[PDB]
Each structure stands twice: as C-alpha cells, then as structure tokens.
Design a protein around this ligand. Structure first.
Ligand SMILES: [Ca+2]
Lengths: 305, 160
C-alpha cells in the first residue's frame, strides 16, 4: 500500500469486529510499548478509481483530531497498508484506555460513586459530546462500553464516526445488540439527529446513580414500553407523524416520580435528567445547554491536599 | 489456538463473566496462549482488577514477559491502575522487573504522572536503578518538573 504498520504496532489481542474489519489491542513499539487500538477499515473503491465515502469519514476523524479535544480518544495515525483496484485497506491507530465505564461502575465500593465524581464525569461526557455535535458528528451508539475512563477519572468518547453499512450479520459473529440506550425516535424508525445522543446521556446519568441500566428492554417494542412506563404516554402532538407504531398501541400511563428509579440524585440533577429523557427530540435539551444547567454549578476542580 | 483467543479476548474486553465461565465452568488453563503468543493476563483490561484476580486465583503466571521484557506489572504501572497492580503484587509479581528500555514499573508510573502508584512502589523498588537514558526514578521525575513525585522519592532515599 504505502505504509508498513506491522513494523510499528504489535497486535496482542483481538477485542472486536465491526462492518469494516477487526479491532485489535496492540503495542506501540515506537512510543514506550503503550497500548493502542488498531482498527482495520477496508475502504471500497468505485468505478472511477476513487475511494468511496468511508475515506471521507476518516477525513472527518482526522479533522476532529486537529482540535485534540480532551474528552475524545486521540487518533494517532492513519496507515494505508494496501491499495488495489477494488479496495484500500487502512489501519486507524487510536489511543486505547484500559477501563470502560461499565467496569468503573462495577468495581466502585458501596455505597456507590461519590456525588461530586458523578457530576465531574457527566460534565466531561457532555463536553465531549458537544464537541462532536458542534462539528455535526452524531455518535448514535453511546453506551458504557464505549465511554472510556482513565485511571485519573478523565472521560474519553470512543467508537464513533464511520457510517452504518450492511455487514454479513457481523461476519456471522457477535450477535446480541443492546437497545437499552436507544432513543425513542430510533426505536420508532423515525428520522434522527443529534438529540439521539442526549437520550443516551440521560440513560447513562441515571445508571451512574443506580449502577444498573434504567430501561432494559429486549426488542424495539419492549424497549419502548419500558420507556413509557416511566416517563408517561406523550401527548398526540409529541408522537411523530408517519411511523408504523401508533401511540394507541401503548398503555395510557402518567409519568412516575423519577426518584422511584433513581435514588440519591439531588433536585438539580433530577431536572437535568428529565430534560435529557424528554420523548420529543425537538424539546430535548442540547449538550451545550446541558453544560449551562445549575447542576454543574459547584464543579470543584482540584483544590489543595 | 482458539481457547487462548477466547479467554484473552474476554480479558481484554473486561468481560469478567466470560472469563469466569471459561475458567470455572470449562476449567480452561489460565496460561493458554492466544494466536499472538500471549496469555490473557498480558493483554487484559488493566483497569479491571476482577479479571486479574480470577486469572491469578486459577494459576496464571504473574511474571510472564513478552519479547522486550514488558510484564503485567509494567502495564498496570503505566496505565496507573493501582487496584490491579496490588492484586498482581499480592500474587507474586516482581516489582523490579526490567523492560527493554531498562525501566522499572516505577519509571513508567513517573513518566505518566501517576502519583499514587509511585508512592506504593517507592519503598520496594530499586531507586538507584538507571534506565537506558541513564536516569534513576528521582532524576526522571525532576526532568519532568514533577515536584510532588520528587518529594515522594527523596523521602525514601534519605535514610540517614
Ligand atoms: Ca494529535
């Protein structure tokens, strides 16, 4: 192709696989032996001999990386390892952090995550997300497994930016898709934009206090029903036009007081929580407005001792 | 070979339930090699002490090294996860192992700024040891301008 990535990175373990290729944990032999994540991305080439839009998405990731936002994982390099008339093979080399939010939440002692740390971690998550949304990138699959947490408690968003494409049911491997953090407009197969990620933030916010997912459905319709049991049946004017599932198919249910499901959250947190878990995407808060909410008022950023 | 792939994949994902299933329900050897030549303890999600613990309770060798001499205690110290480093050293990992740059785990922890790891390692580490750039732990800290780390190290060196 054009670069020999195999001489700089040593694969150590296979950690994943998407529609574009496998993902490896690897060692960066030029930079101390630190771990990185190697994502193989095969880029389709078309009649005209040019890489198709996947190359443009990789361009967007390189663009984003020139800002070096602290709350997204670093893109250290893009290597083209092979070029033929049908495909380019790229290896994307990302910073790898050896802890996700799932594991942090699982190992923390009783009685759970300190209040102030929940606040600091939600502030970093929203800062990362506002950075992506302000460059028109929607994450679309935010969940505790691709929120990485450094040993000093810094949050980094990972696993975003490549278009959703068909792949042979995942190469036939890895088959159980989690719908627990998906937004109602996506479960309804309606049109979606950036508000889909604030729904997921709302679910993760709740989970930081609960240490158990808020809405555990097992299909699109069951996931919706578990949602509406808590927040109540939306008005007819909040139910999207032209979708297959009618408001009628669900219970009439009022909202429940959220403290039945989330204990220990203060009154400012409750307000922000409900503003992320707003059914109609047009009424849901934005990430930039969430950063202004009074909940973040006392952000106690490193005192003495 | 495929069980070493499965077991090390689970460990590197932090899937403690699949690690436990493989080790206790299927009784798999914790030092099985994956297709890259590594065990699960070498490649494991280093911020999940529960993974390290399952693997070490079942017999994994804590002192494995790769080519270069990097062992699990180097990676725990570099990534800064003191909880996993303590599990490793409770099960017999050597805190004075040298990687190929001749660095101790405490050299790596200093380079990354991880001050709770440097306090834990200071009293057991060879604080006179020089890496391949000729730097003891204290000299490295001073070169980074890490005054908090200097104070920790020098308290262990000023025996008098
Ligand atoms: Ca950079």
């Amino acid at each position: 192709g054009l670069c020999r990535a195999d001489q700089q990175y040593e694969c150590v373990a296979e950690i994943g696989e998407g529609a574009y290729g496998k993902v490896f944990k690897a060692r960066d032999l030029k930079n101390g032996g630190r771990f990185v994540a190697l994502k193989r991305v095969r880029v389709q080439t078309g009649e005209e001999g040019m890489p198709l839009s996947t190359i443009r998405e990789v361009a967007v990731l390189r663009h984003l990386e020139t800002f070096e936002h602290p709350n997204v994982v670093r893109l250290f390099d893009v290597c083209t390892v092979s070029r033929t008339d049908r495909e380019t093979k790229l290896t994307l080399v990302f910073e790898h952090v050896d802890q996700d939010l799932t594991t942090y939440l699982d190992k923390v002692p009783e009685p759970g995550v300190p209040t102030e740390t929940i606040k600091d971690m939600m502030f970093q998550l929203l800062r990362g997300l506002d950075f992506l949304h302000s460059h028109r990138v929607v994450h679309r699959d935010l969940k505790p497994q691709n929120i990485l947490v450094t040993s000093s408690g810094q949050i980094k968003l990972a696993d975003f930016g490549l278009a959703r494409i068909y792949s042979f049911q995942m190469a036939l491997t890895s088959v159980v898709v989690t719908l627990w953090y998906r937004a109602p407009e996506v479960l309804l197969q309606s049109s979606y934009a950036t508000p889909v990620d604030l729904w997921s933030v709302g679910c993760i916010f709740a989970e930081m206090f609960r240490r158990k997912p808020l809405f555990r459905g097992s299909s699109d319709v069951d996931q919706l029903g578990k949602i509406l049991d808590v927040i109540g049946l939306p008005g007819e004017e909040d139910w999207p036009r032209d979708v297959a599932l009618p408001r009628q198919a669900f219970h009439s249910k009022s909202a429940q007081p959220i403290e039945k499901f989330v204990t220990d959250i203060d009154e400012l947190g409750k307000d922000l929580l409900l503003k992320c878990l707003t059914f109609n995407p047009a009424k849901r808060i934005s990430a930039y407005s969430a950063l202004s909410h009074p909940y973040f008022q006392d952000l106690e950023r490193c005192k003495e001792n | 070979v495929c069980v070493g792939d499965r077991l090390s994949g689970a460990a590197a994902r932090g899937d403690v339930q699949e690690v436990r299933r493989l080790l206790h329900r299927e009784l798999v050897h914790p030092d099985a090699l994956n297709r890259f030549g590594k065990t699960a303890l070498q490649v494991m999600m280093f911020g999940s002490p529960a993974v390290a613990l399952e693997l070490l309770k079942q017999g994994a060798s804590p002192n494995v090294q790769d080519a270069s001499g990097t062992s699990p205690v180097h990676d725990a110290a570099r990534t800064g996860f003191l909880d996993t480093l303590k599990v490793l050293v409770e099960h017999g990992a050597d805190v004075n192992a040298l990687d190929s740059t001749g660095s101790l785990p405490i050299h790596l922890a200093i380079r990354e700024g991880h001050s709770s790891v440097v306090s834990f390692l200071a009293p057991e580490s060879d604080l006179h040891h020089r890496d391949a750039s000729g730097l003891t732990p204290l000299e490295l800290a001073r070169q980074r301008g890490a005054q908090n780390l200097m104070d920790i190290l020098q308290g262990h060196m000023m025996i008098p």
